[PDB]
């Protein structure tokens, strides 16, 4: 699917009570995201871990 | 412990708005009516157009059915002790039986009392639903006899449309004037017409002429009235203490049993066709206009410390409307003063573009706006 | 609706369902229907 | 008045039953009848207390209604449902047995009302929204106008005899707005439609034979809405007393609104600046 | 617990018609000793599924004697010792002695009182013996289904017997049978297909076993103890990341199906409400004539 | 008190002077609709008019005493046959019993099961008889001995069940339980093998409110040999085609052939895989039907004492609805 | 009949807590007139599926009085259908007037009047309306089917639930059922011209995912398509099954709520009259 | 069918046609309707 | 359940869900500084405690 | 219900910030002081006699 980071989310519709971005936006200096549980940098083909 | 403040109905000021009669055969009666007959007066015109005869007319108004009720549940362990079945021979079971019977008495005391506050509430529920607002009523009694052609009706509705939106709140938007309040109250007390005459009322002041009506309000309005604009007349009044009666016997009986009807004043019709206690109760009167009315606030004597809402806090209903994205025509966009809300120097002026949102105030005053993207719930649907 | 005081008695018994023609309205309930014991009148209270 | 109601009280009687206990259930039949020709009571509604309902905004969501033929491509309308229900309350969450709006948590003020939207050409005059207006444009209603007024267009509008209507998209029979907020078109839902009483002639069966009937009818009409945390539709049988002069006139009042936050400031001043506009309040609530 | 209903006086003539319905059943709302006729009323042209669902959230009650003033009802749910009571059979075919009755909406062509003086309508549900009702519902649904696929519109065998006489099953267009039953047939056929699909998706190789030696053996092993042929349900493929527009989690679908099937099964009656115990009368009561009943 | 039922009828199957009071009676459906529903109900391959003939060979009569029905089944102890034969007054009786046996065996063959033909009434207590015409009277609710029989030797009664058929369950299943108040169930046992089939009757008591698995295990042999010999005479096709395997790999395939609605008549959509679910001759539910039961009431005690019998104890009549037992 | 439950001697620390359990239901095993408290007792919470399977094998009983020696009860349904009694609610959702109630084992545990003196604990089942008890059973059985506020299953009895479910589903497949199975596209196309027709079909319908992916040919005419008709038989069978699918996994609704005077909706933790069915 | 002895007199006169919406059924007439004079009864002349 | 969830909108300005994504979620930045059960207490008084 | 407590707290918030000081903000409206004191005196309720 479309990656959330590339396509900007919204101006107002970010703060709607439904989207899944507030769940990971809770500090003005850090970022949070889901990622494969591997070590970086890893092999070429992204595993399904 | 705590007592129980008993209340009777005939002592209230509200009793003068209704004639109460016991009719122990009401559970048998099918639809009952009352017959009027009125005869309008007439005046003599002249000239060519022919005269007119004097008109008569009859009419009937039928009754309607209401009822009250109140549950009375009593328990298990106690119904064992009341009837003596579960009673044991001790010096301790007897005391518990005494307790249970005191409970039953203290219960029936409250249950039987409720049938007074019941009528005290029922009267307000009835009167409140048959009374038109004053605003929609004052001009209507000003165009009487004229509502035949369309033009008079048109002027009437064009005046209603203003009255309803100009005089629908006094003593909150007018707390500086005193005589406007009094004029509105006089208008309210005089817009109504007297009803039929019955000698069983005799509701009288301690000295002289009888009373005419009630004025039920909330405690707040009564307090704001009884200190700036209205003066008390007295503090006691003579009221009747006995109900009315209506029974079927010895002439209505045969008719209701063989034919199927029974007039009320049957004995009088018969003997014409063939040859043949004032109590002293502490209420609050007042004089307004040229009439004498009771001035009550029943929020404390009744309705207090229970779970029903006082039926005199009404509910007004207005439907607002506002245009969202209309773009004014060309010749109507213009600044009233050349020094406008001038924007920051160097940036384009966003005051010329077609608007796309409206701003208005919330219940308290916080601003809450509505914009197009709130219309997705409507303009995005197959129904479109 | 049914009578209260009979005026006079009938002298000879006869089967009635056979002679239905002589009458205008006819009603033969089995025994003790419900409509008999309903005393429900209707009556005007006041005239003015 | 000195005698406004005859009032007959029957005889009390006790009905007994079993329920752990023994429920004695009193009752008393009683009847009443007005006995004054003409009106015998009147009220004035002097003071004012806090508005029981909020006056905010709540976009009505049509996705709770049925009767609109859905689009062919299922992906299309699935995308629609996913993009309109997002972050929009009163969205029909598929909670068991009802597929109804979920119970909100926390209440700002009284039950939040619902708002509607009616298409309207941009060249509509603005002076039509200063005074009291009718969302239709055809101000027909009932009090002024015989039958055949609500939908005919060969007869000029009563309120503005210059033009015929003020919104062709919302006045013709079977027009756009009509097919959405009318009585006999089966497109109602659980949410209350504040404009349901403007596009419905179904009272044609209830023709009026006197202005006094309409006067008495208002101030005593039963409440259509509910008392929950929103404005839900309520079965007509239950009801409750409420007064409304709008059902008599089929007219609405414009609140204090303006097209930019910069015009609603304490030095009010000018009412038309540029493309932006301001609308003074003209309601029964000047204060 | 006998309730009375205020009756807004209508007219002569019509009140006779109201007197004629001295045996049917009416669905109250709450057990109060008073009620207005306006309350117990339903638009006699209505959706059968919604009416059958509403019949649960109410109480049955039979109309005993009526008078111009009021009419008396007696609820059936609550009661003491299950006292006797009279009932007017109003189904399409008679009911015998010693069986159970069930309450279903007027599935076939409808009859409804039209009290034109009071401007309200009434629906009085049919009274059917248990098995005959459970089969008549299937009859009407199956006829509608056969019509749906545009096949042979008639087979001359949409008939139901009851005590000898042949019944015709009136043509399915009379009042609104093409509109007031669409909901039911849709909501039933759909669920049936969904159950079949879910089962076949959990056991893909069910319909490729022996025509007479494999399928029967699988069923008999499943009914018996825990062999189960391993995970007879093969592990379904792993789903999508739940934002891909083509996600399909089979188990949540099975969950929804269980819920909807249970709900539909409960809103169908088929749980007896009474039982005919006629005594001192003709042992077989024809339609339209009263019949002594004891509540269950 | 208890409430009763009176049904005038013919002295065909229940003969209220031959037996003393206190034995359950059954109501028999009108046979016309059975014969009719057969025409559409008998499975493929079998005969579709043999029930017509079986009925015509037995020529209203409405009731049937269980004492009579139990005799016309497989399970029975010949003492009760002798009793029914030599103790019933009636003419031609043994022949009628034989014909009734043939009727029930035809009923199961035609997949119109007798449990859909015999509603159960209470235990009879009284009767007045003309010449070959009776009017039996049985309880319907409440406990049996609230009644009043016109015997004047034993005003009250009890409930009598032929001990040959009474199958206890708890002491049978060894629940280790302790006898308190137990339910009472009348159960039927079908068995289906074409031209070689029979019916077994029982009267079951236990504390088990839901039979289900209890009978499913009790009648294991019947269900086993009924599921396999039941589909017989139905032409099944040859080996099922591989296209019958319902494809599951294609649900969460991101790349696969797809087709939106609204273009399904004969477009360029032929690229969809074919799947022909083909079910012709496999075991249907009516094929695996083996038993049916119905609740009768509640019981204290059962004692055996005399022809062998089984006297109930404080029977409370509470009749329920029928039940299928196929899984 | 009135079941009598005898009590051992109790400390005042827990007798007064037992007094508060005046409207809850317990599960005996045999209906003798007398029975000791120790008998009617269930172990601490575990395997809500197993417990829900156990409620079927025993008949309930509600208690009314608690004396310092004796504690009465009432066998819920063995011969009666109108014994109006009172029982208190202990489920989260408030049950309103009109609807039936079904007994469901408790979740998360924590509802155990742990009596130390007697060295035992009781777990009174909660009471939920039918509409939600069905859904809860659906969720739990589906979760059990997944393993080939929430406790995990045990893999020893979950197979029994799966077996019951798969049997009740297998016996829906009939040579008539395929005829219905043939009109899935003819159903989808019907669910387009109208609104209600589309409304009845769900969203994750598990059939729309099929009608747009697989074409099926005309059905093979069954043996003797002239004498009998199969769609009717399959539909009758499906009605017979679905009318009894909910109970076979959960529990039949045991009583329906009737209240004559009080407010309609009764909140959690408050007693409310009832009549049994 | 008018009344013979009015129970009580109305106190106030009021234009009654405009307030016609308050009553259930009513009828005006110009002057001296002819129907209200000839009153004919209906009598049963014996029960048996 | 109102203080920390973010499916139910702001019960004061129900347009949006929260007016500051950095001080409302559980374990947010501003929360780890002035929460009662998180133990970063000094001697000074903290108004927003 | 919820809808009543809502209006109640919305009115409390408004009463606290308008009438938290008399005799120093309204010394002109000599009537207003007497009204406030009478409100205070009648606002409570009698105790056991």
Residue numbers in the entry:
A (entry chain w): 494 to 542
B (entry chain g): 51 to 326, 337 to 444
C (entry chain p), H (entry chain m): 3 to 50
D (entry chain g): 1036 to 1054, 1056 to 1323
E (entry chain o): 1 to 296
F (entry chain h): 24 to 82, 94 to 340, 348 to 368
G (entry chain s): 1 to 148, 168 to 296
I (entry chain w): 1184 to 1232
The authors write:
The A-capsid is empty, whereas the C-capsid is fully packed with genomic DNA, and the B-capsid contains a core of scaffold proteins but without genomic DNA. It has been speculated that A- and B-capsids assemble with abortive genomic DNA packing. Here, we use cryo-EM to image both the PRV empty capsid resulted from abortive DNA packing (A-capsid) and mature capsids fully packed with DNA (C-capsid). From the same dataset, we selected a total of 14,252 and 8899 particles for PRV C-capsid and A-capsid, respectively, and, by imposing icosahedral symmetry, obtained three-dimensional (3D) reconstructions at resolutions of 4.43 and 4.53 Å, respectively. Local reconstructions were then carried out to finally obtain the cryo-EM structures of the C-capsid 5-, 3-, and 2-fold sub-regions at 3.31, 3.46, and 3.43 Å, respectively, and the A-capsid 5-, 3-, and 2-fold sub-regions at 3.64, 3.50, and 3.41 Å, respectively. The structures of the PRV A-capsid and C-capsid are nearly identical except for the presence of CATCs in the latter. Because the Tf triplex is located at the icosahedral 3-fold axis, the densities were smeared during 3D reconstruction with imposed icosahedral symmetry. The models of the asymmetric units derived from icosahedral reconstructions of the A- and C-capsids are nearly identical, with a root mean square deviation of 0.298 Å over 26,091 atoms, with the Cα positions of the two models aligned. In contrast, our structural information confirmed that CATC binding or not does not affect Ta orientation at the penton vertex, as the orientations of Ta from A-capsid (CATC absent) or C-capsid (CATC present) are the same. However, the same strategy was unable to procure a 3D reconstruction of the portal vertex of the PRV A-capsid, possibly indicating the instability or altered structural dynamics of the portal vertex in the A-capsid.
